Amino acid sequence: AKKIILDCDPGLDDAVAILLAHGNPEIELLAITTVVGNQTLAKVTRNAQLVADIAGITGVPIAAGCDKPLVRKIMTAGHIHGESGMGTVAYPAEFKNKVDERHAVNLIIDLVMSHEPKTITLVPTGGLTNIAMAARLEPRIVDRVKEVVLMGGGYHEGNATSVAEFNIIIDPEAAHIVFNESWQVTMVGLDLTHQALATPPILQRVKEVDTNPARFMLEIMDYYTKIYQSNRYMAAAAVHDPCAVAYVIDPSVMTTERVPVDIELTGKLTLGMTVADFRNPRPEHCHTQVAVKLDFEKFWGLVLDALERIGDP
Amino acid sequence: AKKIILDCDPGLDDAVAILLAHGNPEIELLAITTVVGNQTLAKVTRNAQLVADIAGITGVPIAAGCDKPLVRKIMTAGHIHGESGMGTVAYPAEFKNKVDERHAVNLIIDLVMSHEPKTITLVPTGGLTNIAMAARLEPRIVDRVKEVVLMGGGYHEGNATSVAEFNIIIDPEAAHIVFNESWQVTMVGLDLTHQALATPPILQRVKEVDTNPARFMLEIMDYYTKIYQSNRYMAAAAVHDPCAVAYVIDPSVMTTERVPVDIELTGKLTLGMTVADFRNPRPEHCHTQVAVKLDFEKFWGLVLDALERIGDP
Amino acid sequence: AKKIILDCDPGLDDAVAILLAHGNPEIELLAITTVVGNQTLAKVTRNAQLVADIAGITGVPIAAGCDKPLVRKIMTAGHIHGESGMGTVAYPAEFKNKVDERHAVNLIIDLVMSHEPKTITLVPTGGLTNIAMAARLEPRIVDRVKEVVLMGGGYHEGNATSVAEFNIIIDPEAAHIVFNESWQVTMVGLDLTHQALATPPILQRVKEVDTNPARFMLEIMDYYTKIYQSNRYMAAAAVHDPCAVAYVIDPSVMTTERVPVDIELTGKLTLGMTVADFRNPRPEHCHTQVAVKLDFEKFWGLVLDALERIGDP
Amino acid sequence: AKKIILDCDPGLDDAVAILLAHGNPEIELLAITTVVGNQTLAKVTRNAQLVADIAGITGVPIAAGCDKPLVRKIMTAGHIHGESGMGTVAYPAEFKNKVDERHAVNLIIDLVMSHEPKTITLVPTGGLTNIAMAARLEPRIVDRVKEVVLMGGGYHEGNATSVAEFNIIIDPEAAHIVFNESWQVTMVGLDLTHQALATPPILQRVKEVDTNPARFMLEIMDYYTKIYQSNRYMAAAAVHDPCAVAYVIDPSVMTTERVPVDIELTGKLTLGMTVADFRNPRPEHCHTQVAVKLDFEKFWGLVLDALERIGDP
Numbered sequence A, B, C, D: 001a002k003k004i005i006l007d008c009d010p011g012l013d014d015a016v017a018i019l020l021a022h023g024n025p026e027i028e029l030l031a032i033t034t035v036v037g038n039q040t041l042a043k044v045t046r047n048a049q050l051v052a053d054i055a056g057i058t059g060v061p062i063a064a065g066c067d068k069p070l071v072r073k074i075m076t077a078g079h080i081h082g083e084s085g086m087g088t089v090a091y092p093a094e095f096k097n098k099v100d101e102r103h104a105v106n107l108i109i110d111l112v113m114s115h116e117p118k119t120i121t122l123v124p125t126g127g128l129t130n131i132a133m134a135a136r137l138e139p140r141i142v143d144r145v146k147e148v149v150l151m152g153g154g155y156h157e158g159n160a161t162s163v164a165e166f167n168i169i170i171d172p173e174a175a176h177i178v179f180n181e182s183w184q185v186t187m188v189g190l191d192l193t194h195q196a197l198a199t200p201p202i203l204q205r206v207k208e209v210d211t212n213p214a215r216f217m218l219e220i221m222d223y224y225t226k227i228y229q230s231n232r233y234m235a236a237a238a239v240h241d242p243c244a245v246a247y248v249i250d251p252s253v254m255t256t257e258r259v260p261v262d263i264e265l266t267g268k269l270t271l272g273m274t275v276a277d278f279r280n281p282r283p284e285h286c287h288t289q290v291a292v293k294l295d296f297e298k299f300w301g302l303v304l305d306a307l308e309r310i311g312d313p
């Protein structure tokens, strides 16, 4: 029912976002496009094929996009997602799903221009390089897109730096382009995603689904959990990306606040920060909004329900 | 018992900080030094004499300091404190208290070098210009000062801009100097001070003290209240400065968190922000700390108690 | 013999660069692509059609490109080239030359990928937005391009600001992208172009060609001259753009120095400056080089010779 | 006849500036104050005593100043002036000249406030830290000072970086303070000082003076020459500092241009650059001017003449 384009950089959590987008009956996945981020474009694209195979996805093109940030030098997060970007999974000899011939930037422009206006929503869960290129190359897509729901940012938290979130800092100028176009933007930041904890009970409910995709998720969630407990301290791992897809499925999974948000491009300490203006006489008629509280039970409900529907292909 | 130097820029709330510092039996006021900020150095200095007269202070030198920020152009806040900086009070023909001969920067260096090590705590409630100059002119004072407790900043709130607080933004390089010296710094920021609301009950308890200093405070608190309800929206006015003195009197009036804090000097959107790093594996052995929650009843208790002791000189 | 793609923003001097590129027998013009700059993309594209008509060009596609800088806000130079961007010329009811269907960015990628390696040289004489987009969208073109010869910058002079040249400052990030790719870049900056003065003798030699294209050039050169004598003071006008094409025709028209050049993105006073490092132990194996001295007679010789060959179509 | 305060950081060339200031009959040296720069404050101060002793100076106070830049971290040039800062000279067991008790910042303010207006000219040949502190601590000195003639900067050359000169970059905010006060500033930059070469003929004329001060200069000039020929390539060494004193003695030793000059504080490539605006409709009524061409013979004449007058004390 809801057509989306999932632009991601398959690392541990992006994989869960793909499973959720596939398994849920409310989402119609038009394409999976990749960008540099968690790992280099090549690795990330190979990972998208791997999970698309595991979940038995067919009829959905997987197109690679930009292999470098717009202006800045490449910066990846291999210390979180392993060298492969997919933690510790072994790849098949051959993938059933092949990388499309078109450049993700062209495919996105193609899909948006060929479909009826306001029917596609973009869901970026990686750096915003491909979305910004597309918006600049064919500005007509900004008024046709239904809305953009991205995982990135943090109005009061950061991870890459004390105040900046990874997806935004790896390409601040692309983020600046996206947040400043007139389309509707929902920022599902760390403020929210730090609530999407994969606790023991949840992992247990997952193990009980007892299917191949489920054993896969259990395996990567395990690796992800080991990293978070050590590296960037938390009792459990936060699985960010699925939260951006969950909001498209059912907006009631989270509360949102409508506030102005811009991107810092020159600060020495604040480079890459999503600056939100919460001072009250609030704007009214503001094209951006941030996510605040997550309905933990409903969120995990949607994931498990998706895992069950995918079954064992 | 606790010797302090109060460096301020007498506007509405700085006045209350002076009354509290004078009236409380726990504080020994060595000097009141002034800086540009709420108004121009001249106005602010005249204001410090006015309240020093009203509270009947004697034996305490009032020394003017820097009339301009270290590098940036002058920026004042006359729209909040009126043209006089002291809102709407009429000045006497002659002041009993006279402005000292020495420059505040020299007086501060003098007091610190002549007293025993670790016995004086600096309490800046204005721009940090004089403190920075002093520390650069005689670096020996940083190891002798007991600690610095300033009113300024905001780890998650701002007023001058969406993320920056007035005292820090009027002279970012001075703030950068102060936060980076090795002395202990307690930042009593907007996060805390926005809790020190002067509500009707409080103003009523004040009117009942029925003394001249009290009528004075009631008068300025009134003007301050009119501005906050209009200009920078809030139901009541937040009286910031006294909070910095209250912490010196009794540290239990507020909770504090020990985290790294630095000042942004080049950001376009974030100039002057006090960037705090709350990401956990927290530092341990960190010379800065921010104030979080205020004990509202104890705070106002201290103020009224001081108003009563000052009496009617 | 020398295949080029002229990327420009038709204003007064870009027009002369087109005439020279068309009339000279050494240049083979594959396409004329436009960008925002002197005027808005629409105006500039209409202007390119106007001069293509006047010079009787046929068989050469004119494709429009980016209508906005990559990240910054649009900035034009209508005070130098008039509102139309073409000073004071009247446009025809219909143009014989039509704007191509393809986006300049796609056309450039097309031409370069379809021709033999190292046979096309890019000649940008406007902001660098289209060249940067193309290099990011299809990175394979940077190794296939023969070299890039652009009019822009100034190692010791500026015009838009005290140290920055218009073409670079209207899109600093695009310029940063171009100067940092590994292809060979020849910067024909203001240091050189300020020598290409259109003095009375030259204008007289032009009037004598007595053809339509020549009367056209005479007309616009006139307006250009009036502006330079008033606005940005000089005895005569400097016609910048043709110098970039002249270097492709005969490199001996100017001397060049091989030195490192980078673009300043964050300076307050120096935004957009082309910083060149002339300190000696010079690099050796440096992909950029700046133009220094112009052979004035040979330069104008090439222009007049081209005007004569175009004749009167 | 011309009273000056020489603020310097005795390294090889600062020493020659002291000899020239002492030996020339036109200069009346009120004091020699030191700052961090070529070496740490301690070393540089010890060096000033060494040369004051060798030249037999008496009746002139030597006062130390700031040991750190205003905001940035300390940066010295020991690779040019050796570890001692004075290249390779051995120090005496005891110095006849003792370091004054007052801080240079206070001494400078003292001298200027106690003498008649417009009779003292400041001659900084090191980082501008002390001059900026003094102008901020007592703003009354800027209108009393006759003018400031400093060695530093470069409108078209740099040494520390491709576009910035050492003295300015070690403390950009101090420089920004000095160039922005209303006093007259003459900038004797690298553009000029690179002409003051100490060629074999000159060194020979010096050896012939055959006195102790002369043998000293010959010794340090030798070391300085070895460094310049290797490190920062040039056929001979450029002795910068004396050029600033020569201009005070006889302004005709060099040509100057009156143009606006400001300091870049945020650029990534251009930090510390003295940006001069040579675009013409030149200001008229401009408090800054840069030095252009040096009268080589007259310059070295003044130095040798001073060496002869000092004789052999």
Ligand SMILES: Nc1ccc([C@@H]2N[C@H](CO)[C@@H](O)[C@H]2O)cc1
Binding pocket: A011, A013, A014, A038, A077, A080, A125, A126, A151, A152, A159, A165, A166, A167, A232, A240, A241
């Ligand atoms: N430590 C860490 C670094 C990168 C990411 C990625 N960036 C976003 C959260 O910062 C998500 O899209 C996630 O894939 C997550 C954890």
Ligand SMILES: Nc1ccc([C@@H]2N[C@H](CO)[C@@H](O)[C@H]2O)cc1
Binding pocket: B011, B013, B014, B038, B077, B080, B125, B126, B151, B152, B159, B165, B166, B167, B232, B240, B241
């Ligand atoms: N709007 C407003 C502006 C300035 C201040 C001053 N700055 C600090 C709070 O921002 C306090 O010291 C206070 O005196 C308070 C209100």
Ligand SMILES: Nc1ccc([C@@H]2N[C@H](CO)[C@@H](O)[C@H]2O)cc1
Binding pocket: C011, C013, C014, C038, C077, C080, C125, C126, C151, C152, C159, C165, C166, C167, C232, C240, C241
């Ligand atoms: N004043 C002025 C402004 C813009 C330009 C354009 N920019 C470059 C020179 O700055 C050329 O390409 C020219 O078309 C020329 C004059």
Ligand SMILES: Nc1ccc([C@@H]2N[C@H](CO)[C@@H](O)[C@H]2O)cc1
Binding pocket: D011, D013, D014, D038, D077, D080, D125, D126, D151, D152, D159, D165, D166, D167, D232, D240, D241
């Ligand atoms: N390489 C080098 C570095 C520092 C200096 C000092 N800085 C100024 C020239 O840059 C002079 O005052 C000189 O003392 C000279 C040479």
Ligand SMILES: [Ca+2]
Binding pocket: A008, A009, A010, A011, A013, A014, A038, A125, A126, A241
């Ligand atoms: Ca991701």
Ligand SMILES: [Ca+2]
Binding pocket: B008, B009, B010, B011, B013, B014, B038, B125, B126, B241
């Ligand atoms: Ca205050």
Ligand SMILES: [Ca+2]
Binding pocket: C008, C009, C010, C011, C013, C014, C038, C125, C126, C241
């Ligand atoms: Ca042009």
Ligand SMILES: [Ca+2]
Binding pocket: D008, D009, D010, D011, D013, D014, D038, D125, D126, D241
């Ligand atoms: Ca020096």
